[PDB]
């Protein structure tokens, strides 16, 4: 359950290795896995909670002025001074105007002049950071096989919550019966914190990488605060008028809050109310399944006479869940579920309940499977054959491989070479892939980082052009690589 309908999902066939598997899962996604045995399990990822933050920065989006004395000496000797220029809690500026007999005093010249203002800010940004510690993931790992009510409703208790923290490991999990399961995270391979900043505005928050959050303009102030009111900056805030000649003036700059939104676009937000809500991100766990029963063994095959309720329920491509309600005696006996061709048994489906089972009797047990690209004849019935349902799966085969390639492409993007890890145990080829793309894309994808939709696509077409006119066969190392990485990564990103 709990996967169905989320689309975007991750079928992982087989394990081998004697044990393990490599799963890369995030948030909006989820994962369904299988082996030649052991029950099909689903890994769905929910809230990530980093507990202890620590507060680095105070940005204020709004302030006000008052008091605000000013002075001028007269228009040579001296550059004017004012005592409140002392306390940096004021803001100060020198300017030059003029004076004379009209001003009354000396000398007829262009004078120096100064001003200062008291500075106070009501609104802030709380931005904090979290060390790659005190942070944890929570997972629901849900069994298939019946037990009514939803392929869905992630609420409700089946796959526990299996929490995990880098401070611990090995992720020992248990479910009813077979439910012994071993997972191992690699959170230190996760979002790469210490590059990260969590930023709380009035409520809404945003996760943005550190440097930019350092370099960002607007009034500075360090995490210590403590009455300090010590704000650096303010030059970019609070602009000063100087109309044509006389005097000068100071102006509260006005709230930038929205403009700050316009800035924080291009960043995943985060809700933070109590301590953390953190969503998104991704993680990599490795799965050792040894330790798993098939959930029932040595039974009798049903008896006969199933009655269906509901119908077909094709989602994505494949899984085709069906709901059925057994009628009879035989008690939790296996359900003879089969998927077959026309007549003349060639029989091929593939079934994911694996080993569906009747429960206590009355309860709407359900199933999911993968018919071929074409016509499908599905049969649950045995002794009087009791049932057959006609089905047709449109689409085909080639299109399937194609779309699959699209998914693997997106996964090469978004997630990087952890993507290469997302399969399992390709021996050499997989590893050498992860490394080649590792340092390779490490150099190339980044460095020509920090660029947006426009400049990306455009630089793409130009460099692929210069490739098209290149000589010495190096065009390919231009060109095919070029256009691919550039274009394909062009439209997919920036979401």
């Amino acid at each position, epitope marked *: 359950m709990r996967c169905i309908g989320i689309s975007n999902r991750d079928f992982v066939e087989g394990v081998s290795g004697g044990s393990w598997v490599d799963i890369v899962l995030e948030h909006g996604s989820c994962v369904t896995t299988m082996a030649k045995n052991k029950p099909t399990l689903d890994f769905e990822l929910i809230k990530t909670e980093a*507990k*202890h933050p620590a507060t680095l920065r105070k940005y204020c989006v709004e302030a006000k002025l008052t008091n605000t004395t000013t002075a001028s000496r007269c228009p040579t000797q001296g550059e004017p001074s004012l005592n409140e220029e002392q306390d940096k809690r004021f803001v100060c500026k020198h300017s030059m105007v003029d004076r004379g007999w009209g001003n009354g005093c000396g000398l007829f010249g262009k004078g120096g002049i100064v001003t200062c203002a008291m500075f106070t800010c009501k609104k802030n940004m709380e931005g904090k950071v979290v060390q790659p510690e005190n942070l944890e993931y929570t997972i629901v790992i849900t069994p298939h096989s019946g037990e009514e009510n939803a392929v869905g409703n992630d609420t409700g208790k089946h796959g526990k919550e299996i929490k995990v923290t880098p401070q611990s490991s090995i992720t020992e999990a248990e479910l009813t019966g077979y439910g012994t399961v071993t997972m191992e995270c690699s959170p230190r391979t996760g979002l790469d914190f210490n590059e990260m900043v969590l930023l709380q505005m009035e409520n809404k928050a945003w996760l943005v990488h550190r440097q930019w959050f350092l370099d960002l303009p607007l009034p500075w102030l360090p995490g*210590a*605060d*403590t*009455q300090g*009111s010590n704000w650096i900056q303010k030059e970019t805030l609070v602009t000063f008028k100087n109309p044509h000649a006389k005097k000068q003036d100071v102006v509260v700059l006005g709230s930038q809050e929205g403009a700050m939104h316009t800035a924080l676009t291009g960043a995943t937000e985060i809700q933070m109310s*109590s*301590g953390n809500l953190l969503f998104t991100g991704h993680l990599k766990c490795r799965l050792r399944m040894d330790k798993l029963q098939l959930k029932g063994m040595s039974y009798s095959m049903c008896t006969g006479k199933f009655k269906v309720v509901k119908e077909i329920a094709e989602t994505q491509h494949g899984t085709i869940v069906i709901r059925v309600q057994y009628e009879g005696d035989g008690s939790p006996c296996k359900i003879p579920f089969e998927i077959m061709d026309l007549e003349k048994r060639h029989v091929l489906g593939r079934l994911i309940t694996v080993n569906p089972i009747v429960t206590e009797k009355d309860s709407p047990v359900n199933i999911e499977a993968e018919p071929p690209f074409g016509d499908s004849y599905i049969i649950i019935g045995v002794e009087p054959g009791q049932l057959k349902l006609s089905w047709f799966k449109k689409g085909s085969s080639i299109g399937q491989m194609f779309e699959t390639t699209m998914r693997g492409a997106k996964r090469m993007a978004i997630l990087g070479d952890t993507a290469w890890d997302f399969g399992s145990l390709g021996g050499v080829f997989t590893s050498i892939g992860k490394a080649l793309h590792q340092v390779f894309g490490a150099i190339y994808g980044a460095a020509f980082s920090g660029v947006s939709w426009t400049m990306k696509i455009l630089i793409g077409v130009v460099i692929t052009w210069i490739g098209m006119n290149s000589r010495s066969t190096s065009l390919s190392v231009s060109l095919v690589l070029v256009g691919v990485v550039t274009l394909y990564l062009g439209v997919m990103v920036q979401a």
Partner: antibody
Amino acid sequence: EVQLVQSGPDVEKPGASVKVSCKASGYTFTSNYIHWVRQAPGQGLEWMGVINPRGGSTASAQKFQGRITMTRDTSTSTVYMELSSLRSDDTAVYYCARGGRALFYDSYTTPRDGGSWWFDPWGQGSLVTVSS
Amino acid sequence: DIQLTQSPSSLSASVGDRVTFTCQASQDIRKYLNWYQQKPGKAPKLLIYDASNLKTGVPSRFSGSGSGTDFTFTISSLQPEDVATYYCQQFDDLPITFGQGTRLQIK
């Protein structure tokens, strides 16, 4: 011995500022953190802030943001708390005490932590009343 | 933030009785918690650190317990001189905070 002598009780007018002193003895005055905790009569304990004797680093709670300065005299092995813009709510008894910790400068949570912050080696308190 | 709840607010008990307090934390505070005794007109005093630990010089009838968010202070045998108000203290994160206190009344 481990000891604290705060200055005697005082009364001030609203909007004013008051300066309470905390003197210590029985250890190396730079070897322990200082914190100020207030108790209003009809209330329990409230944590005002912190100063480090060594080096002068300081911090304060959000409620007293803007209102409280902390300083020290190492020569006298003494700390000074000061509150500004006194208001009737401020009327309470104040307390000061220490911490064993690591230093240079004053926060910590991961290092050591705890150890009778202000229950065994706490000053005698002092009463301050904001009144007209 | 680190809201510390203290229960109950007060208790009356006969001498020799066993008494227990409970403090509940809005966040997991792990082993950082404290137990004060304070007699009226006196500075507060130490009893329990790390929620588990007596101080030297403290009578043995005192004990403390609990781990993640929840904790219990205990006096095995109520003794008259123990009349005071008691507290629990969250040190974690350093927005330093106390429990509201629990008063005793001897029977």
